[PDB]
Design a protein around this ligand. Structure first.
Ligand code: SF4
Ligand SMILES: [Mg+2]
Ligand SMILES: [Mg+2]
Ligand SMILES: [Mg+2]
Ligand SMILES: [Mg+2]
Ligand SMILES: [Mg+2]
Ligand SMILES: [Mg+2]
Ligand SMILES: [Mg+2]
Ligand SMILES: [Mg+2]
Ligand SMILES: [Mg+2]
Ligand SMILES: [Mg+2]
Ligand SMILES: [Mg+2]
Ligand SMILES: [Mg+2]
Ligand SMILES: [Mg+2]
Ligand SMILES: [Mg+2]
Ligand SMILES: [Mg+2]
Ligand SMILES: [Mg+2]
Ligand SMILES: [Mg+2]
Ligand SMILES: [Mg+2]
Ligand SMILES: [Mg+2]
Ligand SMILES: [Mg+2]
Ligand SMILES: [Mg+2]
Ligand SMILES: [Mg+2]
Ligand SMILES: [Mg+2]
Ligand SMILES: [Mg+2]
Ligand SMILES: [Mg+2]
Ligand SMILES: [Mg+2]
Ligand SMILES: [Mg+2]
Ligand SMILES: [Mg+2]
Ligand SMILES: [Mg+2]
Ligand SMILES: [Mg+2]
Ligand SMILES: [Mg+2]
Ligand SMILES: [Mg+2]
Ligand SMILES: [Mg+2]
Ligand SMILES: [Mg+2]
Ligand SMILES: [Mg+2]
Ligand SMILES: [Mg+2]
Ligand SMILES: [Mg+2]
Ligand SMILES: [Mg+2]
Ligand SMILES: [Mg+2]
Ligand SMILES: [Mg+2]
Ligand SMILES: [Mg+2]
Ligand SMILES: [Mg+2]
Ligand SMILES: [Mg+2]
Ligand SMILES: [Mg+2]
Ligand SMILES: [Mg+2]
Ligand SMILES: [Mg+2]
Ligand SMILES: [Mg+2]
Ligand SMILES: [Mg+2]
Ligand SMILES: [Mg+2]
Ligand SMILES: [Mg+2]
Ligand SMILES: [Mg+2]
Ligand SMILES: [Mg+2]
Ligand SMILES: [Mg+2]
Ligand SMILES: [Mg+2]
Ligand SMILES: [Mg+2]
Ligand SMILES: [Mg+2]
Ligand SMILES: [Mg+2]
Ligand SMILES: [Mg+2]
Ligand SMILES: [Mg+2]
Ligand SMILES: [Mg+2]
Ligand SMILES: [Mg+2]
Ligand SMILES: [Mg+2]
Ligand SMILES: [Mg+2]
Ligand SMILES: [Mg+2]
Ligand SMILES: [Mg+2]
Ligand SMILES: [Mg+2]
Ligand SMILES: [Mg+2]
Ligand SMILES: [Mg+2]
Ligand SMILES: [Mg+2]
Ligand SMILES: [Mg+2]
Ligand SMILES: [Mg+2]
Ligand SMILES: [Mg+2]
Ligand SMILES: [Mg+2]
Ligand SMILES: [Mg+2]
Ligand SMILES: [Mg+2]
Ligand SMILES: [Mg+2]
Ligand SMILES: [Mg+2]
Ligand SMILES: [Mg+2]
Ligand SMILES: [Mg+2]
Ligand SMILES: [Mg+2]
Ligand SMILES: [Mg+2]
Ligand SMILES: [Mg+2]
Ligand SMILES: [Mg+2]
Ligand SMILES: [Mg+2]
Ligand SMILES: [Mg+2]
Ligand SMILES: [Mg+2]
Ligand SMILES: [Mg+2]
Ligand SMILES: [Mg+2]
Ligand SMILES: [Mg+2]
Ligand SMILES: [Mg+2]
Ligand SMILES: [Mg+2]
Ligand SMILES: [Mg+2]
Ligand SMILES: [Mg+2]
Ligand SMILES: [Mg+2]
Ligand SMILES: [Mg+2]
Ligand SMILES: [Mg+2]
Ligand SMILES: [Mg+2]
Ligand SMILES: [Mg+2]
Ligand SMILES: [Mg+2]
Ligand SMILES: [Mg+2]
Ligand SMILES: [Mg+2]
Ligand SMILES: [Mg+2]
Ligand SMILES: [Mg+2]
Ligand SMILES: [Mg+2]
Ligand SMILES: [Mg+2]
Ligand SMILES: [Mg+2]
Ligand SMILES: [Mg+2]
Ligand SMILES: [Mg+2]
Ligand SMILES: [Mg+2]
Ligand SMILES: [Mg+2]
Ligand SMILES: [Mg+2]
Ligand SMILES: [Mg+2]
Ligand SMILES: [Mg+2]
Ligand SMILES: [Mg+2]
Ligand SMILES: [Mg+2]
Ligand SMILES: [Mg+2]
Ligand SMILES: [Mg+2]
Ligand SMILES: [Mg+2]
Ligand SMILES: [Mg+2]
Ligand SMILES: [Mg+2]
Ligand SMILES: [Mg+2]
Ligand SMILES: [Mg+2]
Ligand SMILES: [Mg+2]
Ligand SMILES: [Mg+2]
Ligand SMILES: [Mg+2]
Ligand SMILES: [Mg+2]
Ligand SMILES: [Mg+2]
Ligand SMILES: [Mg+2]
Ligand SMILES: [Mg+2]
Ligand SMILES: [Mg+2]
Ligand SMILES: [Mg+2]
Ligand SMILES: [Mg+2]
Ligand SMILES: [Mg+2]
Ligand SMILES: [Mg+2]
Ligand SMILES: [Mg+2]
Ligand SMILES: [Mg+2]
Ligand SMILES: [Mg+2]
Ligand SMILES: [Mg+2]
Ligand SMILES: [Mg+2]
Ligand SMILES: [Mg+2]
Ligand SMILES: [Mg+2]
Ligand SMILES: [Mg+2]
Ligand SMILES: [Mg+2]
Ligand SMILES: [Mg+2]
Ligand SMILES: [Mg+2]
Ligand SMILES: [Mg+2]
Ligand SMILES: [Mg+2]
Ligand SMILES: [Mg+2]
Ligand SMILES: [Mg+2]
Ligand SMILES: [Mg+2]
Ligand SMILES: [Mg+2]
Ligand SMILES: [Mg+2]
Ligand SMILES: [Mg+2]
Ligand SMILES: [Mg+2]
Ligand SMILES: [Mg+2]
Ligand SMILES: [Mg+2]
Ligand SMILES: [Mg+2]
Ligand SMILES: [Mg+2]
Ligand SMILES: [Mg+2]
Lengths: 342, 96, 208
RNA sequence: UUGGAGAGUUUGAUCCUGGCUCAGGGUGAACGCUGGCGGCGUGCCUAAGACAUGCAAGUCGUGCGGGCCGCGGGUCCGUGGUCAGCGGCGGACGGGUGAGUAACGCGUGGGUGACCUACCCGGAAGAGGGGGACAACCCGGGGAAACUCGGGCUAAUCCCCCAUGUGGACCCGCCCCUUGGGGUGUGUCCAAAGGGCUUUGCCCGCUUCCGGAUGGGCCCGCGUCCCAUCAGCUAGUUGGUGGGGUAAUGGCCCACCAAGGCGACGACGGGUAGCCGGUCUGAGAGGAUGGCCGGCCACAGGGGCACUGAGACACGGGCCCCACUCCUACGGGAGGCAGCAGUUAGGAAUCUUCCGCAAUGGGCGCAAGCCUGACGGAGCGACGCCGCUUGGAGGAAGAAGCCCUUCGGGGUGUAAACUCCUGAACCCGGGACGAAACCCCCGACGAGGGGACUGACGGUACCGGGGUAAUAGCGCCGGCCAACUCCGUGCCAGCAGCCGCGGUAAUACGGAGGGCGCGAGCGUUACCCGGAUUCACUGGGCGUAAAGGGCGUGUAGGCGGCCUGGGGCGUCCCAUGUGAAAGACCACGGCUCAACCGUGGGGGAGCGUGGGAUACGCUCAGGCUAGACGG
RNA sequence: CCGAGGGUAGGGCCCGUGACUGGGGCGAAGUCGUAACAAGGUAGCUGUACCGGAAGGUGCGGCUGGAU
């Protein structure tokens, strides 16, 4: 819908200011917008009608793999969740590079119970899944810098890709930053969209446990070429032989996703819920009353959050509850660190 | 927050005062001349009566009275004084 | 706007030959010459008896699609002659024939009315000097349709004036080849034209 | 004689009554899907809810005197600005809303011998002497502010007195008329103002008086919605008299006397509602309707009120009260968007805090000019209507793909691809009309020529040149009703306006292929009319379908036999006045067409006045016996 | 003097609402019996009065829209 931008206002410590124009990058108050709420996308009248999605992070933290069983009805699976991709854009569906299989991401057990239920009872889907949801991520500690030489010049059929990148640690939750820092043009202009596809394909699997790597920063800066031999299918594997090895060399260390719970247990069963919440790797944050009753709120890693579904029944005689939402990332102790690698 | 309407209101007050003046003396003299017209006191009631008639037309010159208003007040006064002086005559002096 | 759709389906649905592709119609490559049954999955089926409304319905559209005119303007022209004197089931066809784009088609200036419209709309036709790009224009008797000077040098009006070296016009029309100009004589009679349309049924329908 | 269409459904079937429902056309619309352009329209119907800020009525130095300033010097005058103040004129028009009102409020035709009218217009006359005050100004108290108060000086087109009376007004006569109309005689009373320029001259003013013109007031006959489950209502109430008041009649107001006034022809009471031009439907009759535009009325936050005035009992003037809101320095004080935009709430929904005084019109003025949210344009919204574009031509016995299929074939389909052709948009140049008046010059500031200036829209329309194939969506496809198959479903999911569909071969559900209908729109909901001859005047009925009152008597009320005449009320005819404009009707013309817009023609009804006719109805009189009563 | 309004007192109409209640409508594979349509197995309908779990029965008078 359109709306009338009328007064353009700014606010001062002592008074108000009406101005004539607002430049890009800046912010302010505009009067006249009748039916506009926050988080809304405003463009000019005859301008690209685009959403600024921007407000980022869906973000999937549970990995549930699905198997199309046997066999010819695999193309209905990829077409079933396709009806849910434009209908529910929070979870993802991406195949595993190593091990090779589709993993249906999601937000929670109930999120990935209704997708499993509805498909089995509205779309038939010849399938049956596992499935845990431990969906770990891996990243580095110190900056790395390697090379990926993918050269085969002993015959007369292409293959020459020389790609040198700098993988440096980016804070957790920041994501993936790719920049082109070629001095002059030691690599052709066309083989930049395709070297990135070897950097991101190798990042779909890990060196330690085989799970995707995030929170890094690849800086392509130099690399040689051969005019006739170099192919676009020669620089891609050059950007994968330097990503499977940079992150593998420079101090690769583990991380996991923690969740926040709010338990509404009667006060008579508090100490039972508390003591166990900590033996569930818990860091308490405080308690408050509610239905009288009382609510308790802490930080518990997802891995120790499976039995807790029915455990609140074992304790509270069936009088408690919870909610559980993801929060952030950290570094598991070396007791579980050095033992998860198996 | 301005406008000469207050200027206009200022004048109307001055006219209201000057107008409320003449009408009082009109009544004061018209009523007195009719009293002495019941007395008779014949001459002594025309003397006042003339002064009244003047004030009737002096106001009518401006906005204090319309002409019909003057014509009306002049008609009644001459009438109601006459029938009074019909109790005992003597029309002296001039006036009618 | 206008129809801009496929047009040989029309002659099939009507059961008549509504000459509208122009040159293509006379040749035996015409749809009607080949397929007379109406289009669609059940064209060849032996038709079922139409109701009287179906009869009058299939007449009203037959007239419209001959001239190519929207329902609005079609009805307003209809409702005009009715509000006028005389027989409505006549002057209607007159006001249909008094349209500038229809006059351009009968004066040979075009292969088809579909084509004549564009030529009118593209400013290539001036009437009595005034350049008139209005197809909805209504023409009166006493007028001289012509091609513009800056539009006399075109490799398409030529081949249509050259086709009209041989063919003759109707009674109520004048033409001047080489000099590429026309002349509107008078308003026609129901005998002057003989369109495959029983005009009574068109008035017989709108009364409902 | 320019105008008139019906369908489905009660049964096994028939005929009828009769209800139900649909097709049509309409909107200040809105909601769904879709949505390119131009034009002319139009856009808070809900909360007459409350509102931030801005703007919406002001002008004259050719009415007066001051504060300051520039300008020519002898701080004197002159002068130009400028600021308020005094004094004129306007603010009573112009703009908005639809609250209230069932009423002379409106509409229509009159009546005023019961009345008024500023500026404008015409005729007649006149402008001579005197006297006085309040602001500005200085001085002074108080306040945050709003700002007020006190003392003194002073100008005029401000106020006062005397003179003049062509005239006018009033008392009583007296004359013609007939409601208080027109004269005249005597007594009585009243006019005023000056400024300016070129100067024994004009110009704008001023004064009393008669006339026109325009604008009203007041009053009257007729017309004007639902409820009788509202049947009786009324003390200023109805009438007189006297007076008050008003421009003027009047119970309008007041004292008094009288006992009256209204009601089934609907008083009183209740509900709703602004009324007309018109608008829409309709074969007509009738129904519904009152946005926009023109005319009238009413209100200006809710109320009461007077003042000024030519005119208001005053939207942006004043006084008081009440509800609400806000400012504050808490001592106090301010405000009224149903003006133009705008905010907020409510809601299904209704817009730019734009430009211009260039035109038109209004106010002030000698003029220049100044003011003008009236007005002219611009903006927004497919809200409405109207025009236009998304291309034209060639192009297979018919590509691919999808669908159907007796697997022979059929269908989409000349459609596309494809060849030819044109050129929406965009780009470049030119560039409007609306604008010639006021005014300067001649003449005579007259008449008549001649002269310059000014364009918001807008560098828009439109004209020249170049110039690219350039948006298509929606509803239906059982019968009404136009348009058919396939699959999925299995009295499920769902459709449905009516009858009715779905229980494993669904033309009815959802999808697809196919088809019908409309097109920048299409469908839906809400409401008005139509079909409804189903409130029936046109134009229905009542034995059994809904409907004869249980049956008499009789009030008002409706209706009334035969012959002749008087009147002319109904009725009929003519003539005239009226029926504004706009619209509609017909004709033509202006914007490239149209919509839109202009010029001109043509009427009606109904009412006023005058004339006539006399059958029929009425009425006054006379007469008959066929009705009716009676012996 | 009149006067907006304020207040005291007493009335009339309308709307919303109320424990509880009185019937009425739409439903449907019920419980109950089986009144009307055939003389419906007691001819039916009817105004009334009384009684009865319920439809209904009965008394009086009426109607034929009652059969042989
Ligand atoms: S080509 Fe033939 S069938 Fe097709 S529209 Fe022309 S006349 Fe009709
Ligand atoms: Mg504890
Ligand atoms: Mg004020
Ligand atoms: Mg004030
Ligand atoms: Mg003034
Ligand atoms: Mg006294
Ligand atoms: Mg006498
Ligand atoms: Mg064909
Ligand atoms: Mg006709
Ligand atoms: Mg017709
Ligand atoms: Mg050219
Ligand atoms: Mg050209
Ligand atoms: Mg019709
Ligand atoms: Mg005729
Ligand atoms: Mg029937
Ligand atoms: Mg029946
Ligand atoms: Mg049946
Ligand atoms: Mg039947
Ligand atoms: Mg309809
Ligand atoms: Mg819409
Ligand atoms: Mg859309
Ligand atoms: Mg517009
Ligand atoms: Mg409002
Ligand atoms: Mg205004
Ligand atoms: Mg200086
Ligand atoms: Mg000097
Ligand atoms: Mg000085
Ligand atoms: Mg001044
Ligand atoms: Mg005003
Ligand atoms: Mg007005
Ligand atoms: Mg208006
Ligand atoms: Mg209006
Ligand atoms: Mg209303
Ligand atoms: Mg009433
Ligand atoms: Mg009444
Ligand atoms: Mg009247
Ligand atoms: Mg009346
Ligand atoms: Mg009159
Ligand atoms: Mg009068
Ligand atoms: Mg005039
Ligand atoms: Mg003298
Ligand atoms: Mg003198
Ligand atoms: Mg003097
Ligand atoms: Mg102070
Ligand atoms: Mg002070
Ligand atoms: Mg004051
Ligand atoms: Mg003096
Ligand atoms: Mg007389
Ligand atoms: Mg005198
Ligand atoms: Mg005078
Ligand atoms: Mg004097
Ligand atoms: Mg001189
Ligand atoms: Mg006179
Ligand atoms: Mg009632
Ligand atoms: Mg009383
Ligand atoms: Mg009295
Ligand atoms: Mg009296
Ligand atoms: Mg009264
Ligand atoms: Mg008495
Ligand atoms: Mg009466
Ligand atoms: Mg109302
Ligand atoms: Mg009818
Ligand atoms: Mg009405
Ligand atoms: Mg109106
Ligand atoms: Mg309005
Ligand atoms: Mg108006
Ligand atoms: Mg008023
Ligand atoms: Mg208000
Ligand atoms: Mg008020
Ligand atoms: Mg008021
Ligand atoms: Mg007021
Ligand atoms: Mg206001
Ligand atoms: Mg005012
Ligand atoms: Mg405050
Ligand atoms: Mg303030
Ligand atoms: Mg104080
Ligand atoms: Mg103070
Ligand atoms: Mg006080
Ligand atoms: Mg005060
Ligand atoms: Mg307020
Ligand atoms: Mg506005
Ligand atoms: Mg407004
Ligand atoms: Mg709003
Ligand atoms: Mg709301
Ligand atoms: Mg709403
Ligand atoms: Mg709302
Ligand atoms: Mg608004
Ligand atoms: Mg102007
Ligand atoms: Mg003007
Ligand atoms: Mg305007
Ligand atoms: Mg538009
Ligand atoms: Mg259109
Ligand atoms: Mg074939
Ligand atoms: Mg075969
Ligand atoms: Mg075949
Ligand atoms: Mg083609
Ligand atoms: Mg191809
Ligand atoms: Mg072109
Ligand atoms: Mg001027
Ligand atoms: Mg002038
Ligand atoms: Mg002149
Ligand atoms: Mg311009
Ligand atoms: Mg424009
Ligand atoms: Mg040129
Ligand atoms: Mg070209
Ligand atoms: Mg195209
Ligand atoms: Mg093409
Ligand atoms: Mg194409
Ligand atoms: Mg385009
Ligand atoms: Mg349809
Ligand atoms: Mg059908
Ligand atoms: Mg059919
Ligand atoms: Mg078939
Ligand atoms: Mg299916
Ligand atoms: Mg459907
Ligand atoms: Mg049935
Ligand atoms: Mg089926
Ligand atoms: Mg159907
Ligand atoms: Mg279907
Ligand atoms: Mg209806
Ligand atoms: Mg019909
Ligand atoms: Mg009809
Ligand atoms: Mg009817
Ligand atoms: Mg009927
Ligand atoms: Mg009848
Ligand atoms: Mg009937
Ligand atoms: Mg009956
Ligand atoms: Mg009775
Ligand atoms: Mg009798
Ligand atoms: Mg009688
Ligand atoms: Mg008789
Ligand atoms: Mg009689
Ligand atoms: Mg006679
Ligand atoms: Mg008569
Ligand atoms: Mg007449
Ligand atoms: Mg006449
Ligand atoms: Mg007219
Ligand atoms: Mg006209
Ligand atoms: Mg005519
Ligand atoms: Mg033109
Ligand atoms: Mg006329
Ligand atoms: Mg005529
Ligand atoms: Mg006629
Ligand atoms: Mg006679
Ligand atoms: Mg006679
Ligand atoms: Mg007799
Ligand atoms: Mg007898
Ligand atoms: Mg009172
Ligand atoms: Mg009070
Ligand atoms: Mg009271
Ligand atoms: Mg009380
Ligand atoms: Mg009470
Ligand atoms: Mg209850
Ligand atoms: Mg039941
Ligand atoms: Mg029985
Ligand atoms: Mg039985
Ligand atoms: Mg029995
Ligand atoms: Mg009984
Ligand atoms: Mg018994
Ligand atoms: Mg029988």
């Amino acid at each position: 819908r359109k709306e009338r931008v009328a007064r353009l206002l700014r606010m001062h410590a002592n008074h108000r200011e009406e101005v004539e124009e607002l430049k890009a990058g800046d912010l302010g108050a505009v009067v006249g917008l009748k039916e506009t709420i926050t988080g809304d996308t405003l463009v000019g009248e005859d301008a690209p009608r685009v959403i600024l999605e921007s407000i980022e992070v869906p973000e999937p933290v549970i990995d549930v793999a699905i198997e199309p069983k046997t066999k010819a009805d695999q193309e209905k699976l990829s077409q079933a969740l396709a009806r849910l991709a434009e209908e529910d854009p929070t979870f993802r569906v991406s195949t595993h590079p190593e091990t090779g299989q589709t993993i249906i991401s999601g937000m929670g057990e109930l999120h990935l119970e209704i997708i499993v239920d509805r498909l089995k009872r509205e779309f038939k889907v010849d399938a049956n899944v596992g499935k845990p949801q431990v969906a770990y991520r891996e990243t580095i500690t110190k900056p790395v810098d390697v090379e990926g030489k993918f050269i085969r010049q002993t015959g007369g059929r292409g293959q020459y890709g020389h790609v040198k990148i700098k993988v440096e640690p980016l804070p957790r939750g920041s994501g993936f930053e790719f920049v082109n820092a070629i001095v002059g043009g030691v690599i052709p202009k066309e083989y930049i969209p395709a070297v990135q596809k070897g950097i991101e394909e190798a990042m779909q699997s890990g060196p330690l446990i085989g799970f995707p790597v995030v929170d890094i920063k690849v800086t392509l800066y130099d690399g040689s070429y051969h005019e006739v031999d170099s192919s676009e299918m020669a620089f891609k594997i050059a950007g994968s032989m330097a990503i499977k090895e940079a992150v593998q060399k420079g101090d690769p260390v583990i991380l996991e996703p923690i969740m926040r719970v709010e338990v509404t247990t009667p006060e008579e069963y508090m100490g039972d819920v508390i003591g166990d919440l900590n033996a569930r790797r818990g860091q308490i944050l405080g308690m408050e009353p509610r239905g009288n009753a009382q609510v308790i709120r802490a930080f518990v890693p997802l891995a120790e959050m499976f039995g807790y579904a029915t455990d609140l029944r074992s304790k509270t005689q069936g009088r408690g509850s919870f909610v559980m939402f993801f929060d952030h990332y950290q570094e598991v102790p070396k007791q579980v660190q050095e033992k998860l690698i198996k | 927050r301005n406008l000469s309407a207050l200027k206009r209101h200022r004048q109307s007050l001055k006219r209201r005062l000057r107008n409320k003046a003449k009408k009082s003396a009109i009544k004061t003299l018209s009523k007195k001349a009719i009293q002495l017209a019941q007395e008779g006191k014949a001459e002594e009631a025309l003397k006042i009566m003339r002064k009244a008639e003047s004030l009737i037309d002096k106001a009518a010159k401006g906005s204090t009275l319309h002409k019909n208003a003057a014509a009306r007040r002049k008609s009644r006064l001459m009438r109601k004084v006459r029938q009074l002086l019909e109790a005992a005559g003597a029309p002296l002096i001039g006036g009618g | 706007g206008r129809y801009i759709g496929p047009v040989c389906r029309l002659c099939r649905r009507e059961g008549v030959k509504l000459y509208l592709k122009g040159e293509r119609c006379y040749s035996p490559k015409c749809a009607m010459e080949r397929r007379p049954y109406p289009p669609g999955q059940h064209g060849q089926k032996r038709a079922r008896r139409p109701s009287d409304y179906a009869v009058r319905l299939r007449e009203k559209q037959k007239l419209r699609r001959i001239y190519g005119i929207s329902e609005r303007q079609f009805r307003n022209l209809f409702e005009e002659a009715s509000k006028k004197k005389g027989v409505t089931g006549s002057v209607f066809l007159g006001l249909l024939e008094s349209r500038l784009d229809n006059v351009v088609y009968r004066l040979g200036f075009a292969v088809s009315r579909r084509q004549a419209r564009q030529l009118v709309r593209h400013g290539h036709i001036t009437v009595n000097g005034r350049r008139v790009d209005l197809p909805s224009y209504r023409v009166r008797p006493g007028d001289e349709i012509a091609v513009a000077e800056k539009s006399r040098n075109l490799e398409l009006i030529r081949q249509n004036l050259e086709a009209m070296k041989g063919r003759k016009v109707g009674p109520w029309l004048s033409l001047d080849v080489e000099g590429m100009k026309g002349k509107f004589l008078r308003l026609p009679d129901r005998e002057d034209l003989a369109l495959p349309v029983n005009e009574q049924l068109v008035i017989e329908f709108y009364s409902r």
